[PDB]
Amino acid sequence: TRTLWTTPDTSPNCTIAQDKDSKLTLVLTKCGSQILANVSLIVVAGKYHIINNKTNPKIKSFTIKLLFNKNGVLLDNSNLGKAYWNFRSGNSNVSTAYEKAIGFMPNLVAYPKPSNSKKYARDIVYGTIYLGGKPDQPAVIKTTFNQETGCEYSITFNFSWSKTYENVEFETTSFTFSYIAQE
Amino acid sequence: YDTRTLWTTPDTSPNCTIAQDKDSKLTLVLTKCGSQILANVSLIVVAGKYHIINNKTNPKIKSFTIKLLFNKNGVLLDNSNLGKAYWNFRSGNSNVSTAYEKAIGFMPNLVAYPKPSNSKKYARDIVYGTIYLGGKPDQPAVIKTTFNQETGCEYSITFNFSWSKTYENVEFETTSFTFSYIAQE
Amino acid sequence: TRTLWTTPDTSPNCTIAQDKDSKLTLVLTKCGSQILANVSLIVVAGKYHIINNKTNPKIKSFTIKLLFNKNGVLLDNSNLGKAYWNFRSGNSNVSTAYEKAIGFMPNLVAYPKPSNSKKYARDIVYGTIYLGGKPDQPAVIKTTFNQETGCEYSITFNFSWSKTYENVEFETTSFTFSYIAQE
Numbered sequence: 001t002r003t004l005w006t007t008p009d010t011s012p013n014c015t016i017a018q019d020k021d022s023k024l025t026l027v028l029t030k031c032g033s034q035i036l037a038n039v040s041l042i043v044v045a046g047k048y049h050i051i052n053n054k055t056n057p058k059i060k061s062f063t064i065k066l067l068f069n070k071n072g073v074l075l076d077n078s079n080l081g082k083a084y085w086n087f088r089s090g091n092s093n094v095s096t097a098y099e100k101a102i103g104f105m106p107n108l109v110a111y112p113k114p115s116n117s118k119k120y121a122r123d124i125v126y127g128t129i130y131l132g133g134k135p136d137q138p139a140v141i142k143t144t145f146n147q148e149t150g151c152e153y154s155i156t157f158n159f160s161w162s163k164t165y166e167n168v169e170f171e172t173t174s175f176t177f178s179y180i181a182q183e
Numbered sequence: 184y185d186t187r188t189l190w191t192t193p194d195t196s197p198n199c200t201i202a203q204d205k206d207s208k209l210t211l212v213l214t215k216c217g218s219q220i221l222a223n224v225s226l227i228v229v230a231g232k233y234h235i236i237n238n239k240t241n242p243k244i245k246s247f248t249i250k251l252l253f254n255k256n257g258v259l260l261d262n263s264n265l266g267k268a269y270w271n272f273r274s275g276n277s278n279v280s281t282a283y284e285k286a287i288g289f290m291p292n293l294v295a296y297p298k299p300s301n302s303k304k305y306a307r308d309i310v311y312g313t314i315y316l317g318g319k320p321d322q323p324a325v326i327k328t329t330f331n332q333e334t335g336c337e338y339s340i341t342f343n344f345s346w347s348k349t350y351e352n353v354e355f356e357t358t359s360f361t362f363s364y365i366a367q368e
Numbered sequence: 369t370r371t372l373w374t375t376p377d378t379s380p381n382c383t384i385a386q387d388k389d390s391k392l393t394l395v396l397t398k399c400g401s402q403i404l405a406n407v408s409l410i411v412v413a414g415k416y417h418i419i420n421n422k423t424n425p426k427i428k429s430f431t432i433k434l435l436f437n438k439n440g441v442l443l444d445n446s447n448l449g450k451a452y453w454n455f456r457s458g459n460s461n462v463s464t465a466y467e468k469a470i471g472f473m474p475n476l477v478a479y480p481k482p483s484n485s486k487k488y489a490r491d492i493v494y495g496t497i498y499l500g501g502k503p504d505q506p507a508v509i510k511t512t513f514n515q516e517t518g519c520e521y522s523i524t525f526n527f528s529w530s531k532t533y534e535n536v537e538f539e540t541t542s543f544t545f546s547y548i549a550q551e
């Protein structure tokens with residue numbers, strides 16, 4: 001019960017532009033009051049599979065949202081599927097779906113919901129990953145905590161790029177970050 | 184110490200003094216994972232010299248430093264930029280009722296990161312990172328963290344904030360950065 | 369036994385171009401399903417000690433490989449010496465070589481060995497470190513999991529730079545990353 005994950009296989013579990021068009025590999029490991037997070041993305045099909053900005057200049061970014069309720073349970077309006085998001089057992093999941101993961105949630109005082117109080121940048125982490133493992137193919141991964149509505153908690157991943165890529169497959173290197181846990 | 188968290192609390196009440204008294208909120212969370220400390224940091228400047236940056240009118244205002252000084256027991260010293268009042272072990276979204284006496288297991292390893300001496304100074308006592316002002320991807324600032332290079336203390340952690348862009352009326356409040364370092368014990 | 373390391377002293381322990389020409393400082397700390405890794409390098413002698421790309425225009429990269437068997441034991445073809453790699457005991461290592469460290473190995477489902485199947489980039493982590501702690505002397509540290517032959521598991525560090533450095537000592541700042549554990 002110290003690790004919440006997608007499993008490490010490559011079976012599509014995520015819907016960006018069309019049903020199960022991607023594998024988001026996300027591993028959350030509870031190190032007390034901090035969650036250690038490891039993420040990568042493979043797109044297998046649809047609009048974001050093969051990037052061509054000569055042909056499609058406007059395709060420059062997309063977002064993957066994980067929305068959670070009071071008990072830390074993934075809501076079905078998330079881009080990530082509920083089917084294999086669960087606590088770890090081996091290279092797989094526990095047999096039954098979890099009902100509480102509040103200790104894996106981003107801290108609401110650290111990272112508050114939108115309000116008429118001043119909005120601070122500390123609820124964001126920026127990173128850069130590399131498409132196809134090539135050092136001249138950067139894309140920015142921007143992670144934001146608790147800024148979606150219709151949820152108690154949220155983790156959102158925005159992927160974007162500034163280069164004009166021609167036929168570059170969107171599959172990434174891995175990035176590690178952390179965040180402050182709710183409890 | 185095992186698995187505990189030493190932190191500033193995660194609210195936005197100013198706890199830190201850069202240019203003038205309580206001009207900033209340093210949010211710092213140190214979590215012990217055995218022989219390494221997992222660190223998470225951000226900064227909000229609320230007042231004074233470094234609150235709103237304009238390098239057109241003031242091209243030479245480009246960097247500043249925040250120091251955490253520790254004694255032999257890992258207790259924060261009063262002359263650190265960070266105030267002692269809310270630097271303590273975690274309890275809920277606040278701190279334990281007793282001001283801590285021992286945190287040597289949270290201190291940067293002195294063999295890995297020695298104090299200044301006339302022996303060769305190696306770069307491994309530094310971690311560089313980049314954070315973004317206002318959460319804007321075109322507003323980077325460098326956060327340089329250095330271990331055990333201060334004097335008048337047994338241990339130290341120093342944060343130097345710098346930028347090479349010419350900012351015009353930009354509020355210095357940052358995204359978050361994560362790093363680790365080797366623990367003394 | 370929760371940390372495998374090199375001892376954080378300055379005594380050479382690694383062979384890049386000639387015997388004991390470097391000190392690799394590597395600390396691997398098990399946080400359940402993830403290994404938290406911290407790395408830096410000091411080159412003390414030989415070809416890579418002082419970089420001069422006026423004199424030697426093509427000297428722009430090198431690699432340090434850690435190769436492991438089925439029990440997570442370091443193999444002798446590794447650049448890092450076997451005598452220097454063990455579980456932590458104080459500021460030193462235990463006197464006896466360990467027999468098992470499978471819990472510290474990179475996960476083979478997450479990071480499979482080379483094959484005829486499609487290779488994904490998530491077995492790579494990119495970072496940048498700074499020579500001599502100077503902010504204008506970046507070098508790229510590319511870390512790759514389980515891609516070497518002659519082993520069950522591997523961690524390889526490729527160091528490279530694009531700048532024309534003139535008489536710059538190769539000793540680095542520190543970088544942190546994580547990876548998914550085999551067990």
Ligand SMILES: CCC(=O)N[C@H]1[C@H]([C@H](O)[C@H](O)CO)O[C@@](O)(C(=O)O)C[C@@H]1O
Pocket residue numbers: 128135136137138494495496508530
């Ligand atoms: C971590 C790796 C890294 O820094 N990659 C950077 C890359 C390389 O430095 C050079 O291409 C030499 O390989 O240069 C960029 O300007 C590019 O778009 O190509 C930005 C990348 O972020």
Ligand SMILES: CCC(=O)N[C@H]1[C@H]([C@H](O)[C@H](O)CO)O[C@@](O)(C(=O)O)C[C@@H]1O
Pocket residue numbers: 126127128140141162313320321322323
């Ligand atoms: C992680 C985010 C990131 O890399 N930001 C970089 C930024 C963006 O790539 C572009 O502005 C396109 O958004 O480019 C810079 O040259 C800039 O100062 O603008 C350096 C920043 O570090």
Ligand SMILES: CCC(=O)N[C@H]1[C@H]([C@H](O)[C@H](O)CO)O[C@@](O)(C(=O)O)C[C@@H]1O
Pocket residue numbers: 311312313325347496503504505506
């Ligand atoms: C974290 C530190 C950092 O970003 N360093 C970058 C550096 C500094 O921004 C400037 O020298 C101003 O100090 O600019 C570079 O183009 C350079 O080669 O000099 C790339 C470095 O990666």
Ligand SMILES: [Zn+2]
Pocket residue numbers: 043044045049169
């Ligand atoms: Zn494909």
Ligand SMILES: [Zn+2]
Pocket residue numbers: 228229230234354
């Ligand atoms: Zn302000």
Ligand SMILES: [Zn+2]
Pocket residue numbers: 412417
């Ligand atoms: Zn020399």
